Design a protein around this ligand. Structure first.
Ligand SMILES: N#C[C@@]1(c2ccc3c(N)ncnn23)O[C@H](COP(=O)(O)OP(=O)(O)OP(=O)(O)O)[C@@H](O)[C@H]1O
Ligand SMILES: [Mg+2]
Ligand SMILES: [Zn+2]
Ligand SMILES: [Zn+2]
Lengths: 927, 73, 187, 187
RNA sequence: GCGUAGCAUGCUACGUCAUUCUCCUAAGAAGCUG
RNA sequence: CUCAGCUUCUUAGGAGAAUGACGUAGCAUGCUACGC
């Protein structure tokens, strides 16, 4: 029977086949599926046992990558598929089916043989690149190897999967680009074929073989010709991140779309690519039903800007990088021609045009001078071209005449303190406490190198039907707070003596620009920024701080015209976030006065089987996608439901993206262009990172909940929760408030979170996470891999099991359960090496004396006190060291003062600092 | 305690060099800072002392910048 | 503080008390003098409080006025500085080439990134290693931005001029990279 | 602070109070002495508050002047303090390589390039006198920084490569010092 | 027995001086965290 | 040489509470003088 069946399978195609089945029996294998039926839902990995698969052999007896699959099904589905295939035969993007009947024992059993398929469907590729696990990724190695994307031994490299270690993996993935583009074209052809043939059915990923030929016609209901409805919400949306991970549209940069032919020479003066964007959308995403506005200026709400921007972040990787950035124009001001920005061409939000352009102006008040002197049009138009080959980021101009190299000093040394420590049995050979935090020095070109670190920021397209729901859930985490636009006289700025970016740092600190402008003008500038875009020149400074690793952290000092208005826009909400206790975003909650025990016991909010986990993002601000930061700025700007209109909010978003996301960075006397990612010097950085972190965690939860099989969820509440979550993602276009609240309650009851910028501590239920009904460490590694483009190693992830010890590390402060006042409380202690390093190595040279810097060792001992009850003794003596050294400093100060000028200091207030009672009072809940 | 006494001598030595205006030599400063960062990142002690020898040789290369005779006494 | 009418009354009452105490040890004289001294002390304390308050208010007003005057002076100074900077950079951009590129623009708006790329008569290429020099700007004339640039100076990381012939693979280590090479626009 | 005139009143009245409490003459005298003691106590209290405030101000002035002077002294005296600290730490380190290199550089045997650490690399070290040559150099072997280096070309001050056999004992005076010996690590 | 003044004790209100404590505005030095 | 949070310390200022002291006004009670 084997040869009779195999011979029939190898029909008129005239092919030679090797059978993978045993005796013409069904084959069972693991395969991804985008399944949504009456029973289960979710893009998970199932067993597939309905088909018998043979593999073709080319000449010379070698297995070519082509398979003859043979589905076996009842007569009803066979007859319903025969008609729908004969009605779709003429389409070229459809695998050549072959229908027949076979006798096994005493009855016919129809067979639908799909011919010339490939081993891995598109769903397998999407799942492998979307749910990535280091330990077992064998559907990605096979896909890469079998399609000439790399060598079989390319996977012997140390870290072949790490976007940060070896950026060559990007090229290996991009070698899949043409196949994905051909899949897009073939699915557009198939949608057209079924529209012209009047077939209505759902398009699933797991039916398109990697070549592109669709091969399943089961649930294709038929209607009159010309009235087909191909449902492509769960296909074009699950295929989004893979569409820029593999740079599917790179081949659109070449003339006539051919890869071989040279790049299409776009005329440099072109900035309005609206026609090209619309043409690309109608060529690839033809049947994506929702409207696409290439310029987001004419969108409808916060949920349409995300959609349009998510499409633009892919349609702008075809157009030249020298056409984005500000649009300049010659405005005459009393007969002198300026070159001022009169718009912007964002990579995501399309073309934005200012509404207040006044050629032939007469007077320039302080506000107008502030706006013009900040725009990079004058600076980068009057500067001389510059081709900096030390980096990959674009380069605009060189304001100065010659580059400036900034070094980093090596950090002074505190000889007396180190001698005292060594005398008191410290820094011995092989001790539990050792010097590990040093002041590292850097060569001339450190600043440019740490700016070049932006090469990790790639254009990332985010699954939109999942992001538009994760945004709602993330918003529920911010519903407690209140905020809005505040007038200029309600603004609170901590210190006004901190520099004001560029070029405003050439004439004064921020105090000059905050006191030289009246409140009416300071508010007129804000109302102006609410009606047009003002580009700004950020300046990247170096940080001179003690650290355990020798990367020279750079901080993006933003211009005054940007911070001074982001404050009016965001201060109310930021203070509301910093003044709310018991919320997910623990900002403003001190670790002193029992403020850390409160944090921990708020985290442990009735989660049945707690198992703490925590993750630190590697390069949180230099790898955060543009889309996630745009969404974060939208979530913080949704409190303005009354103060600002829709266009006002959009222009505020455009200003934030012009001044933070993709700006002109003046990294040491030259204007480069940031690819993206947040500038960690703007008003909303520690709060715009919190939103991004919560978005990543919630997306991990969504993926972990969906990717479960569905029949193996014993709990019948969670099965229905999954079945409704999938249809709320991919089968609903409007917000489902009741279900958003239900899922937020589910997350709070099973995924309690404590988020602080990029430092998170989850207290997830252990049994559900084991069963996959909530996130986990792998379910977050995968999310980072396919959304942040950084593989998160196990060095930045921890998972505790005994709640008593508390989190392994949160904000660099370990936690310990200790006895205090008849009750056990969690005290945070630092790394002792950090405290000893802060003692021995000091920033300045005047601080080295110590005798006139006793108010520093008190503040170090305040942080080092908790160590005084650590079980280890070398850990706990790094506090008595500070107490005894403060006593020594006081004695020496008294002696020196007596010698130089005979005045015995008034004691009884300085004797608290070398007694533990004063420091122990700092960790009691009285205040 | 012979190990953690090199990670501090290297800091002081690079501070001394940075005061002799060795920053100007963009290659000598790169070599000095690389030796400094490698000494500070030195699990072993033989490597730390070899790199300290090299850095001190940088300091002694300068003819009259530092008066060895006045100090070693 | 011997000021205000209250102090005169206080002094007169104190003198009367001192004179009458000897004349009258107790009784009506002492009681009346004590009452007068007490009321005078109350009035003097009232006047002293009013002074210490009004003087403080006036001093606060004067310091506020000085702060406002200095703030206005700094406003004027920074406005003048910004205007001078704008007029310096406004008189430096290539009016000929920049106006030419803007004229052939459709709407009149041109992306900023192509203002220096096509109208700047200088190029400062920073080269991190020799191979880059060999493969990007070899010789005394190279081609960038579809324009022929000619070298005019090659300084090293020390801002010390480096001759073109000195740069070779054999003599590459002896240099101080990166090399900043300034080239003009040779039509 | 019992060193101000008001305290004297505190004594006198208090003294009288003492003489009263033993005497217990009557309640009218008790009230009179209580009033006197209360007024004296208020006067002394005001004086003591003034004295303590002034002493605190003086202490703040002294502890600001001292801090400013010490900061200025430390900032000014840092070029030499760093070098003294460095060599104190080096001589306390007590390592053979550092000690040998410092001792050699004491007497003019400074190296002309960073001492290499690879398997073999160039090192050019000057030699002032024949005594140092005898101490460290011998035939083709060279003992510097506690490692054997292979002599290659002893270069005279005049760039005249001198054969090793020339330099021996009393023949040195003819040759014009200081030599520049090259060497490579021999591990 | 009641009223005015005077003396004595007690209570309420108000105005000052001082000490201590708490909170809040502002200025300065410093430390830690993302 | 950026954004934000937290904390220690010093001084200036404002408000409040408690205690002590002084003074003025008012009220409760005891006593001498003048009154009835
Ligand atoms: N807020 C904030 C910031 C941050 C750090 C330091 C500063 C600063 N001085 N000003 C403003 N923001 N800021 O915190 C994020 C994470 O900081 P973390 O020290 O974990 O650094 P990574 O994770 O980038 O590095 P890795 O984990 O590889 O060591 C940054 O990205 C940035 O947004
Ligand atoms: Mg991190
Ligand atoms: Zn839209
Ligand atoms: Zn608003």
């Amino acid at each position: 029977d084997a040869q009779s069946f195999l011979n029939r399978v190898c029909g008129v195609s005239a092919a030679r086949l090797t059978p993978c089945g045993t005796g013409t029996s069904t084959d069972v294998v693991y395969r991804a599926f985008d399944i949504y039926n009456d029973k289960v839902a979710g893009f998970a990995k199932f067993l597939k046992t309905n088909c018998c698969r043979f593999q073709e052999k080319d000449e010379d007896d070698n297995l070519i990558d082509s398979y003859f699959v043979v589905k076996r099904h009842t007569f009803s589905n066979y007859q319903h598929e025969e008609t729908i295939y004969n009605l779709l035969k003429d389409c070229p993007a459809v695998a050549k089916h072959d229908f027949f009947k076979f006798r096994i024992d005493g009855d016919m059993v129809p067979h639908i043989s799909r011919q010339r398929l490939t081993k891995y469907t598109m769903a397998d590729l999407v799942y492998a690149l979307r749910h990535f696990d280091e330990g077992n990724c064998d559907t990605l190695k096979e896909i890469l190897v079998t399609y000439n994307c790399c060598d079989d031994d390319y996977f012997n490299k140390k870290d072949w999967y790490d976007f940060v270690e070896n950026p060559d993996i990007l090229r290996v993935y991009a070698n899949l680009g043409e196949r994905v583009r051909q899949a897009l074209l073939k699915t557009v052809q198939f949608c057209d074929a079924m529209r012209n043939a009047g077939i209505v059915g759902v398009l699933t990923l797991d039916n398109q073989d990697l070549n592109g030929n669709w091969y399943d016609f089961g649930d294709f209901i038929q209607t009159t010709p010309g009235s087909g409805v191909p449902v492509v919400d769960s296909y074009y949306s699950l295929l989004m991140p893979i569409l820029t991970l593999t740079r599917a549209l790179t081949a659109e940069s070449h003339v006539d779309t051919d890869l071989t032919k040279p790049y299409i020479k776009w005329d440099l003066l072109k900035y309005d690519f609206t026609e090209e964007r619309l043409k690309l959308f109608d060529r690839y995403f033809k049947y994506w039903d929702q409207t696409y506005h290439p310029n987001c200026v004419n969108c409808l709400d916060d949920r349409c800007i995300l959609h349009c921007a998510n499409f633009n972040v892919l349609f702008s990787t075809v157009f030249p990088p020298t056409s984005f950035g500000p649009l300049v124009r010659k405005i005459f001001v009393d007969g002198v021609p300026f070159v001022v920005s009169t718009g912007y061409h964002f990579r995501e939000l399309g073309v934005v045009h200012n509404q207040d352009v006044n050629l032939h102006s007469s007077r320039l008040s302080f506000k107008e001078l502030l706006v013009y002197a900040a725009d990079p049009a004058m600076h980068a138009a009057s500067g001389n071209l510059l081709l900096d080959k030390r980096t990959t980021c674009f380069s605009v101009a060189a304001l100065t005449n010659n580059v400036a190299f900034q070094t980093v000093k090596p950090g002074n040394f505190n000889k007396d303190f180190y001698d005292f420590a060594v005398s008191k049995g410290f820094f011995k050979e092989g001790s539990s406490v050792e010097l590990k935090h040093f002041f590292f020095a850097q060569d001339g070109n450190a600043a440019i190198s740490d700016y070049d670190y932006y090469r990790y920021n790639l254009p990332t397209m985010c699954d939109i039907r999942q992001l538009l729901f994760v945004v709602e859930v993330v918003d529920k985490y911010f519903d407690c707070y209140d905020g809005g636009c505040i007038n200029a006289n309600q603004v609170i700025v901590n210190n006004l003596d901190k520099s004001a970016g560029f070029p405003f740092n050439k004439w004064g600190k921020a105090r000059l620009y905050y006191d030289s402008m009246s409140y009416e003008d300071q508010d007129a500038l804000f109302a102006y920024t609410k009606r047009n875009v003002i580009p700004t020149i950020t300046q990247m400074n170096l940080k001179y701080a003690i650290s355990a690793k020798n990367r020279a952290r750079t901080v993006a000092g933003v211009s005054i015209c940007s911070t001074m208005t982001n404050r009016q826009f965001h201060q109310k909400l930021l203070k509301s976030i910093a003044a709310t206790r018991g919320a997910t975003v623990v900002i403003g909650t001190s670790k002193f006065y029992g403020g850390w025990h409160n944090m921990l016991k708020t985290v442990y909010s009735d989660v049945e089987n707690p198992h703490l986990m925590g993750w630190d993002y590697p390069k949180c601000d230099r790898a955060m996608p543009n889309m996630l930061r745009i969404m974060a700025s939208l979530v913080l700007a949704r409190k303005h439901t009354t103060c600002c209109s829709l266009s006002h909010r959009f222009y505020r978003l455009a200003n934030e993206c012009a001044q933070v996301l993709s700006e002109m960075v003046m990294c040491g006397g030259s204007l480069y262009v940031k690819p993206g990612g947040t500038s960690s010097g703007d008003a909303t950085t520690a709060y715009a990172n919190s939103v991004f972190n919560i978005c990543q965690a919630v997306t991990a939860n969504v993926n972990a909940l969906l990717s479960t099989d569905g029949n193996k969820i014993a709990d019948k509440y969670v099965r229905n929760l999954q079945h409704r979550l999938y249809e709320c993602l991919y089968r609903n276009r409007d917000v489902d408030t009741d279900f958003v609240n239900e899922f937020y309650a589910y997350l709070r009851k099973h995924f309690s979170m404590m988020i602080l910028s990029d430092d998170a501590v989850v207290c997830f239920n252990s049994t559900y996470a084991s069963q996959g009904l909530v996130a986990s460490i792998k379910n977050f590694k995968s999310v980072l891999y396919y959304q942040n483009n950084v593989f998160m190693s196990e060095a930045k992830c921890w998972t505790e099991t005994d709640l008593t010890k508390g989190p392994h590390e949160f904000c660099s402060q370990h936690t310990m359960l200790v006895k205090q006042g008849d009750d056990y409380v969690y005290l945070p202690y630092p790394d002792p090496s950090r405290i000893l390093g802060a003692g021995c190595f000091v920033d300045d040279i005047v601080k080295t004396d110590g005798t006139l810097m006793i108010e520093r060792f008190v503040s170090l001992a305040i942080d080092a006190y908790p160590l005084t009850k650590h079980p280890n003794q070398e850990y706990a003596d790094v506090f008595h060291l500070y107490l005894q050294y403060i006593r020594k400093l006081h004695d020496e100060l008294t002696g020196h003062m007596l010698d130089m000028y005979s005045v015995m200091l008034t004691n009884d207030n300085t004797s608290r600092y070398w007694e533990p009672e004063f420091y122990e009072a700092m960790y009691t809940p009285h205040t | 305690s012979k190990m953690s006494d090199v990670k501090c001598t290297s800091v002081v030595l690079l501070s001394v060099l940075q005061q002799l205006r060795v920053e100007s030599s963009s290659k000598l400063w790169a070599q000095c800072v690389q030796l400094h960062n490698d000494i500070l990142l030195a699990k072993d002690t033989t490597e730390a002392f070899e790199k300290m020898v090299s850095l001190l040789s940088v300091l002694l290369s300068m003819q009259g910048a530092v008066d060895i005779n006045k100090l070693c006494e | 503080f011997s000021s205000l009418p209250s102090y005169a009354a206080f002094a007169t009452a104190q003198e009367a008390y001192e004179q009458a105490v000897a004349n009258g040890d107790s009784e009506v004289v002492l009681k009346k003098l004590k009452k007068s001294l007490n009321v005078a002390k109350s009035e003097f304390d009232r006047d002293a409080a009013m002074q210490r308050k009004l003087e403080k208010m006036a001093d606060q007003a004067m310091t506020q006025m000085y702060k406002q005057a200095r703030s206005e002076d700094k406003r004027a100074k920074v406005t003048s500085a910004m205007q001078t900077m704008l007029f310096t950079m406004l008189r430096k951009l290539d009016n000929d080439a920049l106006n030419n590129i803007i004229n052939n623009a459709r709407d009149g708006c041109v992306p900023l990134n192509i203002i220096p790329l096509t109208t700047a008569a200088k190029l400062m290429v920073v080269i991190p290693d020799y191979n880059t020099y060999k493969n990007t700007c070899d010789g005394t004339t190279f081609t960038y931005a579809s324009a022929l640039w000619e070298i005019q100076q090659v300084v090293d990381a020390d801002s010390k001029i480096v001759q073109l012939s000195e740069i070779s693979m054999d003599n590459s280590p002896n240099l101080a990279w990166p090399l900043i090479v300034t080239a003009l626009r040779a039509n």
